[PDB]
Scaffold this active site. Sequence first.
Site, PDB file in Angstrom:
ATOM      1  N   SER A   1      -1.383   9.111  -6.617  1.00  0.00           N
ATOM      2  CA  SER A   1      -2.010  10.408  -6.863  1.00  0.00           C
ATOM      3  C   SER A   1      -2.183  10.732  -8.350  1.00  0.00           C
ATOM      4  O   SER A   1      -2.945  11.650  -8.679  1.00  0.00           O
ATOM      5  CB  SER A   1      -1.207  11.527  -6.184  1.00  0.00           C
ATOM      6  OG  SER A   1      -1.283  11.427  -4.746  1.00  0.00           O
TER       7      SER A   1
ATOM      8  N   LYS B   1      -5.781  11.023  -9.757  1.00  0.00           N
ATOM      9  CA  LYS B   1      -6.622  12.217  -9.632  1.00  0.00           C
ATOM     10  C   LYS B   1      -7.020  12.770 -11.006  1.00  0.00           C
ATOM     11  O   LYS B   1      -8.115  13.310 -11.168  1.00  0.00           O
ATOM     12  CB  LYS B   1      -5.910  13.298  -8.818  1.00  0.00           C
ATOM     13  CG  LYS B   1      -5.762  12.895  -7.351  1.00  0.00           C
ATOM     14  CD  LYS B   1      -5.058  13.917  -6.464  1.00  0.00           C
ATOM     15  CE  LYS B   1      -5.086  13.539  -4.973  1.00  0.00           C
ATOM     16  NZ  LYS B   1      -4.453  12.281  -4.629  1.00  0.00           N
TER      17      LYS B   1
ATOM     18  N   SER C   1      -2.686  18.293  -4.567  1.00  0.00           N
ATOM     19  CA  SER C   1      -2.881  16.853  -4.418  1.00  0.00           C
ATOM     20  C   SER C   1      -3.670  16.533  -3.144  1.00  0.00           C
ATOM     21  O   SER C   1      -3.354  15.592  -2.416  1.00  0.00           O
ATOM     22  CB  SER C   1      -1.540  16.120  -4.437  1.00  0.00           C
ATOM     23  OG  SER C   1      -1.641  14.915  -5.172  1.00  0.00           O
TER      24      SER C   1
ATOM     25  N   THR D   1       2.388  14.773  -9.813  1.00  0.00           N
ATOM     26  CA  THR D   1       3.274  13.863  -9.106  1.00  0.00           C
ATOM     27  C   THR D   1       2.464  12.806  -8.365  1.00  0.00           C
ATOM     28  O   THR D   1       1.256  12.948  -8.143  1.00  0.00           O
ATOM     29  CB  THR D   1       4.174  14.592  -8.098  1.00  0.00           C
ATOM     30  OG1 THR D   1       3.353  15.248  -7.135  1.00  0.00           O
ATOM     31  CG2 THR D   1       5.072  15.624  -8.778  1.00  0.00           C
TER      32      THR D   1
ATOM     33  N   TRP E   1       3.224   9.529  -5.160  1.00  0.00           N
ATOM     34  CA  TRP E   1       4.149   8.826  -4.277  1.00  0.00           C
ATOM     35  C   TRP E   1       3.323   7.899  -3.395  1.00  0.00           C
ATOM     36  O   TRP E   1       2.590   8.361  -2.509  1.00  0.00           O
ATOM     37  CB  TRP E   1       4.967   9.811  -3.439  1.00  0.00           C
ATOM     38  CG  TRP E   1       6.086   9.198  -2.621  1.00  0.00           C
ATOM     39  CD1 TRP E   1       6.252   7.877  -2.297  1.00  0.00           C
ATOM     40  CD2 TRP E   1       7.184   9.899  -2.017  1.00  0.00           C
ATOM     41  NE1 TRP E   1       7.390   7.715  -1.534  1.00  0.00           N
ATOM     42  CE2 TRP E   1       7.979   8.940  -1.347  1.00  0.00           C
ATOM     43  CE3 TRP E   1       7.574  11.242  -1.980  1.00  0.00           C
ATOM     44  CZ2 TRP E   1       9.141   9.285  -0.652  1.00  0.00           C
ATOM     45  CZ3 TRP E   1       8.731  11.583  -1.285  1.00  0.00           C
ATOM     46  CH2 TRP E   1       9.499  10.606  -0.633  1.00  0.00           C
TER      47      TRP E   1
ATOM     48  N   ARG F   1      11.929  13.860  -7.791  1.00  0.00           N
ATOM     49  CA  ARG F   1      11.266  13.523  -9.045  1.00  0.00           C
ATOM     50  C   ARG F   1      11.298  14.703 -10.011  1.00  0.00           C
ATOM     51  O   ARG F   1      11.535  14.524 -11.212  1.00  0.00           O
ATOM     52  CB  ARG F   1       9.825  13.079  -8.763  1.00  0.00           C
ATOM     53  CG  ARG F   1       9.709  11.854  -7.834  1.00  0.00           C
ATOM     54  CD  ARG F   1       8.336  11.772  -7.155  1.00  0.00           C
ATOM     55  NE  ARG F   1       8.047  12.978  -6.383  1.00  0.00           N
ATOM     56  CZ  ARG F   1       6.886  13.250  -5.797  1.00  0.00           C
ATOM     57  NH1 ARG F   1       5.878  12.392  -5.821  1.00  0.00           N
ATOM     58  NH2 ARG F   1       6.728  14.417  -5.179  1.00  0.00           N
TER      59      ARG F   1
HETATM   60  C1  LIG Z   1      -0.162  10.767  -4.177  1.00  0.00           C
HETATM   61  O1  LIG Z   1       0.521   9.981  -4.808  1.00  0.00           O
HETATM   62  C2  LIG Z   1       0.021  10.849  -2.670  1.00  0.00           C
HETATM   63  C3  LIG Z   1      -1.244  10.345  -1.999  1.00  0.00           C
HETATM   64  C4  LIG Z   1      -1.555   8.950  -2.483  1.00  0.00           C
HETATM   65  O2  LIG Z   1      -1.023  10.285  -0.582  1.00  0.00           O
HETATM   66  C5  LIG Z   1       0.360  12.296  -2.305  1.00  0.00           C
HETATM   67  C6  LIG Z   1      -0.878  13.166  -2.099  1.00  0.00           C
HETATM   68  C7  LIG Z   1       1.295  12.365  -1.092  1.00  0.00           C
HETATM   69  C8  LIG Z   1       2.588  12.841  -1.714  1.00  0.00           C
HETATM   70  S1  LIG Z   1       4.028  12.952  -0.869  1.00  0.00           S
HETATM   71  C9  LIG Z   1       3.922  11.818   0.487  1.00  0.00           C
HETATM   72  C10 LIG Z   1       3.423  12.534   1.743  1.00  0.00           C
HETATM   73  N1  LIG Z   1       4.289  12.098   2.853  1.00  0.00           N
HETATM   74  C11 LIG Z   1       5.576  11.661   2.269  1.00  0.00           C
HETATM   75  C12 LIG Z   1       6.582  12.776   2.237  1.00  0.00           C
HETATM   76  O3  LIG Z   1       6.230  13.931   2.028  1.00  0.00           O
HETATM   77  N2  LIG Z   1       7.857  12.423   2.425  1.00  0.00           N
HETATM   78  C13 LIG Z   1       8.966  13.294   2.058  1.00  0.00           C
HETATM   79  C14 LIG Z   1       8.233  11.132   2.994  1.00  0.00           C
HETATM   80  C15 LIG Z   1       5.288  11.245   0.833  1.00  0.00           C
HETATM   81  C16 LIG Z   1       2.419  13.125  -2.999  1.00  0.00           C
HETATM   82  C17 LIG Z   1       3.439  13.610  -3.931  1.00  0.00           C
HETATM   83  O4  LIG Z   1       3.303  13.345  -5.142  1.00  0.00           O
HETATM   84  O5  LIG Z   1       4.430  14.256  -3.531  1.00  0.00           O
HETATM   85  N3  LIG Z   1       1.167  12.868  -3.370  1.00  0.00           N
END
Ligand SMILES: *C(=O)[C@H]([C@@H](C)O)[C@@]1(C)CC(S[C@@H]2CN[C@H](C(=O)N(C)C)C2)=C(C(=O)O)N1
EC number: 3.5.2.6
Length: 246
Positions: free
Chosen positions: A52, A55, A99, A190, A192, A232
């Site tokens: 992400s 972006k 995001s 952020t 992930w 984070r």
């Molecule tokens: C960006 O990095 C990521 C995109 C690529 O999907 C994004 C939008 C998702 C998240 S959190 C991700 C959603 N489902 C998982 C979750 O919430 N847990 C706790 C397992 C992880 C992010 C982010 O930066 O938090 N961005």
Amino acid sequence: TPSQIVQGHNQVIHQYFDEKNTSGVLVIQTDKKINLYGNALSRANTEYVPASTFKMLNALIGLENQKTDINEIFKWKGEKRSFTAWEKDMTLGEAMKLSAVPVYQELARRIGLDLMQKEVKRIGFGNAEIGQQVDNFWLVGPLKVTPIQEVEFVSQLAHTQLPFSEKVQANVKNMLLLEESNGYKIFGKTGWAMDIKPQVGWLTGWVEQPDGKIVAFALNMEMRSEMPASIRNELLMKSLKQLNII
Ligand SMILES: *C(=O)[C@H]([C@@H](C)O)[C@@]1(C)CC(S[C@@H]2CN[C@H](C(=O)N(C)C)C2)=C(C(=O)O)N1
């Protein structure tokens, strides 16, 4: 007389990551000087998918090449999105804060593979390779970038020194504002990536101190599915405090 263990901020931040049972690095840049902190400093020069954090560059390229503007409202067209909070019409800047992946997938497809690859190469972002899939190249490869490259990028953004128009950079900066208090501002994004192994977590941005000084950061760590996303933010804020940046 007993011995006393004397904890400096280097040792403290290293142990912050140990306490979460994972590997991470915190890259700091200010006044064109880069310092590395954390328990896995070799991550700083290792390439990871940007996830992400891409972006930021997506928005710069889209605005610069007039594929969108900061007032355009991207419509939710009715598919079930990953989060209910994303199921609304919203601007590019609101999608940055949330995001909201589908807004940035729509923007990437507007830019198109050809223009996207030329702009990414012109900027020299990471390995500057995007492949043939315009809607996910920042998540599952081939695009990769090091944390040092991300701090260099975001510090240039903060200083409006990237090779984009100054107005475009100013508008994207405004989309990244996370908190303001007591004359400090913190900006960041952020990330992930859960579909790759090991998972990678990002938090890249900068602090503007009351006198205007910019201190940029790129946190990069291995994630596991059990962690709260806020791990984070907690690691970053504790470390910035230890370093007297805030
Ligand atoms: C960006 O990095 C990521 C995109 C690529 O999907 C994004 C939008 C998702 C998240 S959190 C991700 C959603 N489902 C998982 C979750 O919430 N847990 C706790 C397992 C992880 C992010 C982010 O930066 O938090 N961005």
